[PDB]
Structures are given as C-alpha cells and as structure tokens.
Design a protein around this ligand. Structure first.
Ligand SMILES: [Zn+2]
Ligand SMILES: [Zn+2]
Lengths: 45, 50, 39, 33, 100, 335, 243, 49, 101, 200, 67, 48
C-alpha cells in the first residue's frame, strides 16, 4: 500500500475513500501519492 | 481580501533568512513583484502615456 | 452502432495517426470518415 | 544552324499565362521619389 | 537578435523547481556557469543558476553539412551527456459537484 | 621531398604521401615486405600501468590513422545497459542516474564473456556467460552524534554520499568458480554518484554486458588515443650575442639551450616542444631557423579508462584489423 | 521534387536550391504537399520539376547555383599554386562521384622531375568525365575582380592575377571560379551553358558532381579565420591615425 | 514598411492582369477573346529563353 | 559462406576485368583509407579511390581501375591479401620489444 | 515528465546573436584532434564573421582559452574588461599559439591540414523550439462544421492553408489540373444535384 | 547538480576529483590554477569541467519533503 | 531529390489503382501492414 503522504507533516497514512481530504497530525490539506513498490525498467544511454 | 505582491512588507516573505524561506520552500533568488490570483502568477506591466 | 458487413456492436476510434476514423473491431471496415467537430 | 535553332526555339509558345508571370516578375523587392 | 533570444535560453529556474507545478516547464540536466562573465551578471546572480554550457569549438568548414550557420557535433559528447534537456508538463482536472 | 612537412607562419606544405610507384619516371619505392622489415622500428618510451607511450617509425599517415580510429571504435568493453530499479526516493530522478551508471568503468576485461544475441527474446537472451549483474542498496539516516550546527554533513548523516565502491557485485551461478580469483570493481571506486538526505533510499540492480565502442561512448576502453609528429628545427646561421637569450625565452624552457663554451644556441633534448611558432613574429629569425616536422615519426600516447593494460588494446587493435581484412578474402564476389 | 526516405526527423534537401527559397536554416519551417491523382502527379514534374526551372522567368538568368561556400571550395582547388600527385588526384576525382563514373586521366602538367597535375585539370574532369560523355563547351568570361593587364599590348588573359578565364574543348585554360563563372547573377556562367547546349538532364548531372566533391573535400583541406587574419598589421595603425 | 506593401502591391496588379494567354496564332488576348496586343513585344518570343 | 559483402556493380564495369567498382557493407573510413594505400603501391594500378555515398546508411564504395596487364578484380585480391602481411610485420616487431622492454 | 537528447533540428544559439540548427551528428573518429588529442565539440563555419561582423566571439575565444590554463575566470564587460595584449602573454607561456590560431590533424585521413585552425571553448546555450513537438502531419482528419475544411492549429490536428499568394504561383506555371485537385478534390469535394430549368 | 562523471570531449572520468578539489581549498589555501594541475588535469577540456561547474545539488537538498 | 523522414512518410499516403502490371508488388506491400515503412494504411475494394 503505502498510501497518501502529506507535504510537510510527511506522515504515512491510508485515507479511506470519499471521507476526507486533509491529513492527520496537521490541518494541512496538500498531500502526495508515494512511489509504488512495483519494478520499473530503464536503459543506460 | 486584498491580493498583495510578493516581497512587500505585508507578506511573510519580507526579510527572510533562507530558513523561514527554506520552511516556506521559496527560492531566495526570486525577484518578486507579482500576484498569484487563482493559481497562475501574473504581473502588472509599467505603462506610459503622453 | 451497427456495422454494414458484420453488424458489429462495438466501435473503436483510431487516434494513432490522427485520422480519427471509427472502425468496427471484427472485420475492420470503417464506419465514418472526416469527423465534423464543433469549434 | 544553331544560330537559328536557338532563335526558332526562343519563339514564344502558345498557352503560356504571360499575364501571370509578368505580374510576378515586376513584383519583387530638386528631388523625386 | 540575442536579447530576443536570451529570454528563450534554457537552464535552471529556481531552487524549488523540483516542487512547483507549472504548465510547461523545461530544465537542463547539467548546467555550467560561463567562462567569460560580466560585471552585470554577478549583480543579478545569473552565475548562481546559469543557462547553457560552454563547449570546445573548432570554427571550420567540414563535410559540407554546415553551409550558412549550421552546426556540426559528435555522437560521443551527446553520449557523454552534452546538454540533455528535460520536459515537464502539467495537466489538471477538477472533480465537480452537480445540483442533484 | 625529404618527408618533412614544411610549416611556416601561414601554411604547411606537402602533407601528402608521395610514396608510390608511378609518381616519377623512375618507379622506386615499390612494395616489398623485406625492404620494409629492414626499415620499420618500434621505440617504447616511458611505459607503466594505466598509460603508455611509444614510437613508430617510417610509416605512411594512412594506416597510422586507422590504428587510432580502431582503438576507440572497435575494441569492446563492458558497461551498464539495462538498470532495473526498485524503490528510489532520491531527488536525482530515475533515468538521470541510470545514465550515470553506464559511464562508470569496469576493471574486468572482455574475452571472459560472449556477445549477446538480440534476436532472442528477453527471457533467455541474458545468458550466464554474456551478462553479469551488480547492485547496491543504501538508505541515508540521521547519525545520532553531537556536532554543532552547520558543520560537515558527513557526520550529521551516515552514508549520505554514495560512491562507486557501493556497487556490490552479485555473482550468478556457474561463474563464481571463474570469478573467484578476480572480483570485479569500478576502475575508480571514489566517484561521486549521488547525494541523499535522511528518509531517502536508493535500490536497483544493473545488467552490464559486452558492447562495442562504436555503438556508444560507454564501451570505449580508451580515455583518448592520439599521436603527434616529431618537430624538427634546422638552424641556418649561428645565433650569437643577446639574440640567443631572446631566442631562448620564445620556447618551452627545456627544448633548446645555450652553449656555455661559446655564445651560441643549440638543440637540447627534443620532443618537448609544442609548435608555438613564436619565432615567426620577430622578423629577425626569418633566415636563422627553418623549422619543420618529420612525416614518419609518431608519438603514440594512449591511456586506458581502467579496463585493461594500454599495451594490450594496441596489440588488440592491429590483431583485429588483420581479422577485419582476412575475413573478406574468404567470401565470394557476387555480381 | 522526388522523395527519398531517411530515418531522421526533419526535411533534408540538396543545398544548391536554397537560393529560390531564400531559406536560412535558423528555425524556419517548410511545408510539403502531395498530389493525389494519377494525372496531376505527372503534371508537377513536367512543369514544376527543378530540371525545367534552372532559369528564372524574371530575366532568363540561371537562378540555382553554388552558394556562399561552394565557390570557396572550388576556388582553393583552382588556385594557381595547387599541385597534386596521382595518388591525391585519384582520391579527389573519386569523391566527386560515388565511385561509379568511369574516368580517364589526362597527362600531367609538370613531367620531368615528377608527374604533377594541376588544380584545373581535375576541374576539367567534372565537366567531361570521358570521351563517352557528349558534353563539350566553349566559353569566355570575366571574374569578379579582374585586375587589368597592360591593356594595349597584352590581351585579357595575361592579367596580374589569373583573372580572365578561358575554356576550349572543356578544359580549364585560364582563370579561377569566383561566383561570376560558376555562380549566380551573371548570365555567362558555366552551369548556364551546359543547360543551354546539352539539355536539363546533363546540367543537373554535372553540378551535383561538384556538390558531392566540395562537401567532402575542404573539410579535409582546412580553412579557418581568427584574430591575426582580421587584425591590423600595425602599419594601418599609424596611417589611419593621421589620415 | 516594405514587406507589407510589396506583397500587397504585387497582389493588386495581379488581380487586374491574371488572365492573358497566347493563342496559337501567336496573338495574346484576354479571357473574353479580345485583342490586347498582336505580338508580345515587337516580335513575339519567349523572354526567359 | 556469406554474400552480404563486397559485390561488383554490373552497371559501372568494363567488359573485361580491367575496371570495376565494388560495394563494401559495414565498413567505414577505417578500412577504405588503409586499403587505398596498400593498392596504390602496386605498379600496375592507375586509379583506386573510395567514397561514402551517404553517412546515414552504412556502406562503402571502393573504385578500382588499372591497365590491361592484370584484371582489377585480381589486383585487390592481391591488395587485400597484401596488408594482411603488413599487419604481421608490425605485430612481430612490436611484441618482441614488449617482452624485452 | 520526459527528457530527450539533442538530435538534429534543435535550435542552438551563441549568446552573440547567432541562430543555428544542428545539421548532422558525426562520430568521434571522423572528428579532428589536436596534438594532445582534444576533440572539439561543436563545429561552425568561418563564413559568418565577415557578414555578421561579430568581433566579440573572435576575442571571447581568446579570452576564454587563456583563462582555463591559468585557472582563472575572466571578466568580459562593456566599454572595458580584460584587454588582448595582456591575454596573449598568458597562453604563449603555456606554449600555444599567440592568438589561439592552432593547428590540428584530420580525423578522416590522418595528415596535417593545409591551413591553420582556430580553437577554444565558447559558450553555446540551447534555445526553445525543439523539433519533437513541431513535426505534425494531417493526412485525412477532422473537418470544420461550417466550411468542411481542415482545422487550423496543430493541437487541433492541423491542415495547412494553401493561401492566395500560392494560388497565383500555380497558374504562372500554367498547370490547370492539380489546381483543382489541391483546392477541391483533396480539400472541399462536395456533390450537388442542381435542376436544369429554374436553375438552383 | 552533481559533477558529470566523464569529460564532455575526451572522456576520462572526473568523479573522484570534485571532493578533492573542495578539500584542496579549505585546507592549503592555494590558487585554483595550480591546484587541479597538481591533481592531474593536464587537458584544458578536463579543466573546464570543474571550473564552470556550479553545484546546485546542495541548494536543492534543503527542500526535502522528509524534514 | 528531397529527403523525407519516415515517421511522416508512413502517414502521408498516395492512392494506387491495381493493374496486372503492379499486382505482384502490391501483394507483397499489403502484407506489411501499417507498422513497417513500405506498406499501406487503408484499402477500398470496388464492391466495398
Ligand atoms: Zn499532516
Ligand atoms: Zn432547375
């Protein structure tokens, strides 16, 4: 999972859907999706 | 509510020390002098007439 | 909604080369050409 | 031979829109202007 | 001719450039300060975040592929990373509530 | 003739070969391998690791150039080609540093592996003898010591600066018996690769394979391969008086010296002059010195990136040129 | 034009036609069209093909020519102190084609000490490669500079420079090529004359042989500019400061 | 000041003069079959050739 | 064996083997400059040049033209056999100076 | 997010007002090289400096090269700055030519070049207007609702305007068959039944 | 950002020498021209890779979202 | 001769009636499809 993280509170949390838009531990209302665990592939040129 | 330009004495960016501005993640090298009405940042040009 | 040859019920729009033609999936016959957008 | 082979070839052939080429040949980039 | 192009030069933008979300914003990967500076550019701190890099020029005709002010460069220096620019682009949408 | 490029203030002369029969009426200098075997010579200068310097005599400029080109075209080496990424929360985004992985040298030599065949699909294409895998996993954290503020961020944060030594080689099967004696490393394990903050981790593994330098600049085993030609200075009149000390300061300091017996300039140990051509400006040495450049002396200077010894690639250069030219001797001519 | 498919991402044209389009290669963009009949496809070649339009209808002058450095490539070749052995005369003559046209070598100019060809017989071969080519021309013309001879006893050929150019039987006999002999603007040019007396097909076939040469050539001969060849030589300093 | 007018000036007279073709009698005439001049110039020859 | 290699052009050849023009695949100026010099030291040949048609595609055209003594197809077969020996005499002289040092 | 490599087409500049587009991309073997083997990065022809009269790049390249070997950055100001005669003294002590006019071998054939070269580091900044987002083509696409014509604008799939000035240039050739084909066949073909008497 | 790992033109590596260039200026107050020439940068194509290199990655990392 | 890049060359098409002369080439051309360069994009049978 590792769901939405806040901007400067930086607290990992899993928001349940259609419920809120803010984060816990702070009233700040801009939050980022974290990077997946899934493998990705690149080249080297 | 009065939309006010950056680096004016009424904004919080006035006389920062790149530590408050580090916490407010703004560039120290930014000139300032422009509005942030509803997203996009705009600036009023300097007009002249006769 | 219905093709003329195979009577196909699903229509796919090709956006690859920006022709924007609408083609049935089964046999590949085009349903419409030269789209008319509302500018 | 060639002095009238070039003269005869230089004769204006029919069908040329000589109005069109003349308009675009003239259009190109005390006192009087 | 340069002052109309100087506004179109790619380089850095700001220190928070990995944080802002603007419409269509380019970056240069490896910028460098210029070799011959000016007293002007050290007053606006252009050198603190420059635009463009300085390469080794050999002014000459070569292979006829530079006739009037074309340029000729080598495959290796691009493969070493000669100015690999990068395009960042915003896109947005709004969830919208209806009357029902 | 006299195989000397005549340089001057605005030109050079006769830079071509003029070494063929059919150039004059008397057709001399025909092809004879034994008359070349008497004349060809190799001088080796200061030779060591990582770098070489050696001389070649009495060769036309044609096949001297093809040696320089092949050493940075054809002789293969190994570098990263596909970087499989894991969780990576650095500020350096993904394809930037994955480009920087491939530009790091590797100490292991080719001919220990084989060419990869791209016609096969990418499940058995990466075999056990054409592909070796290396990886690194590092997570920056806070170092809980007691410095004061704004000091060096090497003891505030553990492993904040990553280096080439962090690339841990992970052996595949069937080859740990082969690479038991020789572990593989970057040629310079002190290269800065990225910087981190606590809360940011980098995890990936790479597939470095065998590729040719003419495809991409990762695979070139040489730093840079070049050659000079030996400068030659011919003095007409003996320079006497105060002009000789004026003649000395317009050179590199070691190339010519004053005779201490009589006041006359002579030539010291050569091969240390780059052509500054400063003697042409002063218009008082326009007849004293007629300097030139010999068209058969070659200061080969090569140095490796770290893959193998610099004398080996030079041995490998002339060997594969034969194999290049012997290959099409044994193929038919189709109309 | 005819098309040719190449794997890059932009439009590539031969350089000598840039003078009609007055393009400058600085970010200008062109547009191409394609007809879609089987009749109008034949219409565009037989009237708007570039073989039919070497001459402008404004005056009748040859408009496509060598541009601002195809002259100076073909100028250093035709310089009077340009001498070549066979080994280099072979390589120069092999670069004006792709090793396809069969040539025959005229005897060299300097013969007793060694065999030396000049920088003009090589230019004579791009016009007439061999006896099987039907092209043979005759032309007298004046260069751009043309410092005059003694003007009453000496004719135009005996200039102080090479100056007045003479070709008889398609061999260079005097003169150099300095944009008044092979280039644009003047009527009495070389590429005008092969267009005049040998049709349009041989006119294009003789001048792209120059383009494939002067591109490959002078990047291997070398030419540059700097301070010492733009600076005053210190004798213009005391003369300008008083005059 | 010139690039705007010249393309406009070379369009103005183009409109009044666009249809004049040579018939097979070596006589140029308008679209309505009316004579303008009997021969092009004094002799009727191609000016480009 | 292979046939995607040296390949005589039928359009630009003589009726005999006196003049021909061959087309080398997958070889740049590294070979054509070397192969030009080993051929020109044959006293029989009069004309042997090379060129690249277009640098996007990858092929070389070598031109050969000689007198009526030997057919030119026999000359480069001697020619590209001849530098194979020249690669050896450099290799033999060099490797003995390495071991001696 | 995407990045890209500077392949040909991309508009470069020179900071003294020279627009410039990448012509081709050579390999490193074909490039020339000095006595040390330094391979130059960008090539420009000498044919701009007499026309454009850009003396500044001719003296900046001297001001740049002597600063690198001295390890010091040099100031180029207006109405002053570092001069020339004190700058030539630096690199002549390093051993190069006294006005940067060096000489270097050819990478394609080996030997010397008959003229001398001019060499050094210059500051080439990349511009906007890259070519990956200007190439577009409209074969047969959307039509306008009022005119049945192609839609102006690349983001609206394009379809270029064969204007009135090109229409004069067609009939000056006297071609009369693609003139209808490029103006109603591929563009605006529409089939109308009309009555003979009371004609509309 | 960070120093390029190789040179642009020749292509010997300079990644082990950015920290050594900084370490040769805190201690041993020295001229910059004689500093890296002592380190072994004979080619001036290599010398411009470190003179001109503004290192913005220090100023970027102070905007980390992890506090 | 002008050079045309291939990524625009496999978009801009040109119609071509089949004949007994060009039947052999168009059979090999239509099996390429619209992915490799020397192929086709659309087709119209005279009954269609
Ligand atoms: Zn929070
Ligand atoms: Zn009716």
């Amino acid at each position: 999972t590792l769901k939405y993280i806040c901007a400067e509170c930086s607290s990992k949390l899993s928001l349940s859907r259609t419920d809120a838009v803010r984060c816990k531990d702070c009233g700040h209302r801009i939050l980022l999706k974290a990077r997946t665990k899934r493998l990705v592939q690149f080249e080297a040129r | 509510r009065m939309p006010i330009m950056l680096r004016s004495n009424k904004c919080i960016l006035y006389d920062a020390d790149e530590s408050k501005m580090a916490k407010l993640n703004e560039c120290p090298l930014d000139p300032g002098g422009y509005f942030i009405v509803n997203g996009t940042e705009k600036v009023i040009l300097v007009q002249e007439q006769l | 909604p219905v093709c003329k040859n195979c009577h196909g019920t699903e229509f796919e729009r090709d956006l690859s080369n920006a022709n924007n033609d609408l083609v049935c999936k089964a046999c590949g016959v085009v349903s419409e050409d030269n789209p008319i957008v509302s500018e | 031979e060639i002095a009238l082979f070039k003269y005869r070839k230089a004769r204006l052939e029919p069908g040329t829109a000589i109005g069109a080429i003349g308009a675009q040949s003239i259009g190109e980039p005390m006192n009087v202007t | 001719y340069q002052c109309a192009m100087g506004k179109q030069a790619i380089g850095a933008i700001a220190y928070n450039q990995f944080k802002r979300i603007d419409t269509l914003l380019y970056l240069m990967t490896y910028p460098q300060q210029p070799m011959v500076k000016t007293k002007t550019i050290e007053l606006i701190d252009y050198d603190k975040l420059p635009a463009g890099q300085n390469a080794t020029v050999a002014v000459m005709s070569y292979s006829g592929y530079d006739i009037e002010d074309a340029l000729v460069l080598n495959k290796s220096s691009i493969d070493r990373g000669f100015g690999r620019c990068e395009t960042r682009r915003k896109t947005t949408t709004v969830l919208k509530r209806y009357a029902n | 003739m006299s195989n000397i490029v005549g340089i001057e203030y605005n030109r050079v002369t006769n830079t071509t070969s003029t070494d063929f029969p059919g150039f004059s009426k008397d057709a001399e200098n025909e092809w004879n391998v034994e008359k070349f075997k008497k004349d060809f010579e190799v001088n080796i200068s200061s030779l060591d690791a990582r770098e070489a310097n050696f001389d070649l005599i009495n060769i036309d400029t044609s096949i001297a150039n093809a040696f320089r080109r092949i050493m940075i075209s054809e002789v293969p080496s190994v570098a990263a080609e596909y970087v499989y990424f894991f969780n990576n929360t650095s500020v350096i985004q993904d394809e930037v540093l994955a480009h920087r992985i491939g530009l790091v040298p590797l100490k292991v030599d080719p001919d220990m592996l084989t060419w990869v065949d791209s016609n096969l699909p990418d499940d058995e294409k990466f075999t056990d003898e054409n592909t070796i895998v290396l990886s690194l996993n590092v997570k920056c954290t806070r170092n809980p010591d007691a410095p004061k503020g704004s000091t060096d961020p090497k003891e505030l944060y553990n492993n904040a600066h990553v280096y080439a030594r962090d690339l841990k080689f992970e052996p595949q099967g069937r080859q740990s018996t082969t690479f038991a004696d020789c572990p593989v490393v970057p040629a310079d394990p002190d290269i800065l690769l990225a910087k981190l903050r606590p809360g940011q981790e980098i995890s990936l593994k790479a597939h470095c394979i065998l590729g040719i330098g003419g495809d991409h600049a990762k695979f070139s085993p040489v730093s840079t391969a070049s050659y000079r030609l030996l400068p030659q200075i011919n003095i007409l009149q003996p320079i006497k008086g105060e002009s000789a000390r004026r003649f000395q300061k317009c050179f590199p300091p070691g190339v010519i010296g004053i005779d201490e017996g009589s006041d006359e300039a002579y030539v010291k140990d050569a091969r240390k002059d780059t052509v500054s051509r400063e003697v042409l400006r002063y218009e008082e040495f326009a007849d004293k010195v007629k300097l030139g450049r010999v068209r058969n002396h070659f200061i080969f200077n090569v140095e490796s990136a770290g893959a193998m010894t610099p004398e080996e690639i030079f041995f490998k250069s002339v060997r594969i040129l034969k194999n290049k030219a012997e290959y099409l001797k044994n193929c038919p001519i189709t109309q | 034009h005819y098309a040719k498919i190449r794997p890059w991402r932009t439009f590539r044209l031969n350089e000598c036609v840039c003078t009609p389009y007055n393009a400058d290669f600085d970010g200008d963009e062109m547009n191409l069209h394609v007809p879609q009949t089987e009749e109008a496809r034949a219409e565009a070649i037989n009237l708007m093909g570039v073989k039919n339009n070497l001459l402008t209808p404004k005056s009748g002058e040859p408009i496509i020519a060598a541009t601002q450095d195809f002259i100076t490539g073909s100028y250093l070749i035709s310089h009077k102190d340009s001498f070549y052995d066979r080994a280099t005369l072979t390589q120069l003559l092999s670069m004006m084609s792709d090793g396809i046209e069969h040539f025959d070598i005229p005897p060299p100019a300097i013969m007793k000490p060694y065999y030396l060809w000049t920088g003009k017989q090589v230019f004579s071969l791009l016009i007439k490669p061999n006896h099987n080519s039907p092209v043979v021309i005759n032309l007298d013309a004046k260069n751009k500079v043309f410092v005059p001879p003694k003007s009453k006893s000496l004719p135009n050929e005996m200039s102080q420079n090479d100056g007045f150019v003479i070709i008889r039987g398609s061999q260079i006999l005097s003169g150099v090529m300095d944009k008044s002999v092979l280039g644009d603007g003047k009527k009495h040019s070389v590429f005008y004359t092969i267009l005049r007396d040998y049709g349009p097909q041989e006119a294009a076939n003789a001048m792209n042989r120059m383009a494939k040469l002067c591109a490959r050539f002078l990047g291997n001969r070398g030419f540059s500019i700097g301070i010492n060849d733009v600076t005053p030589a210190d004798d213009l300093k005391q003369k300008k400061e008083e005059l | 000041v010139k690039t705007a007018e010249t393309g406009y000036m070379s369009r103005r007279l183009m409109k009044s003069l666009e249809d004049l073709s040579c018939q097979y009698d070596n006589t140029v005439r308008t679209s309505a079959n009316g004579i303008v001049q009997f021969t092009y110039g004094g002799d009727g020859l191609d000016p480009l050739e | 064996p292979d046939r995607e290699k040296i390949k005589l052009l039928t359009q630009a050849t003589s009726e005999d083997g006196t003049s021909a023009s061959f087309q080398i695949v997958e070889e740049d100026h590294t070979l054509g400059n070397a192969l030009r010099y080993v051929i020109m030291k044959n006293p029989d040949v009069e004309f042997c040049g090379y060129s690249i048609p277009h640098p996007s595609e990858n092929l070389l055209n070598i031109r050969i033209q000689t007198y009526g003594e030997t057919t030119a197809v026999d000359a480069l077969q001697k020619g590209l056999k001849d530098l194979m020996d020249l690669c050896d005499v450099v290799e033999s002289k060099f490797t003995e100076k390495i071991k001696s040092m | 997010r995407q990045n890209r490599r500077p392949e040909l087409g991309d508009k470069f500049s020179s900071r003294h007002g020279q627009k410039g587009v990448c012509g081709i991309i050579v390999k490193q073997e074909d490039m020339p090289f000095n006595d040390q083997g330094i391979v130059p990065d960008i090539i420009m022809n000498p044919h701009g400096f007499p026309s454009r009269m850009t003396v500044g790049k001719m003296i900046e390249l001297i001001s740049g090269k002597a600063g690198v070997l001295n390890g010091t950055l040099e100031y180029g100001t207006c109405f002053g700055g570092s001069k020339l005669e004190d700058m030539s003294k630096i690199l002549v002590d390093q051993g190069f030519n006294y006005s940067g006019k060096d000489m270097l071998y050819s990478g394609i054939t080996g030997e010397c070049l008959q003229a001398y070269i001019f060499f050094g580091p210059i500051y080439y900044q990349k511009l906007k207007h890259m070519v990956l987002d200007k190439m577009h083509a409209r074969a047969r696409g959307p039509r306008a609702v009022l005119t049945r014509q192609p839609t102006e604008g690349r983001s609206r799939d394009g379809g270029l305007r064969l204007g009135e000035m090109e229409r004069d240039c067609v009939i000056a050739y006297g071609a009369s068959q693609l003139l209808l084909e490029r103006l109603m066949i591929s563009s605006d073909a529409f089939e109308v039944d009309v009555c003979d008497k009371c004609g509309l | 950002m960070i120093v390029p790992v190789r040179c642009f033109s020749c292509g010997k590596v300079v990644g082990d020498k950015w920290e050594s260039y900084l370490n040769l200026l805190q201690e041993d107050e020295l001229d910059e021209g004689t500093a890296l020439s002592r380190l072994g940068l004979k080619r001036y194509c290599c010398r411009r890779m470190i003179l001109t290199h503004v290192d913005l990655i220090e100023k970027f990392l102070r905007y980390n979202p992890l506090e | 001769e002008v050079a045309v890049p291939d990524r625009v060359a496999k978009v801009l098409t040109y119609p071509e009636k089949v004949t007994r002369y060009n039947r052999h080439k168009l059979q090999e051309l239509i099996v390429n499809g619209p992915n490799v360069h020397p192929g086709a994009n659309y087709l119209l049978k005279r009954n269609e």
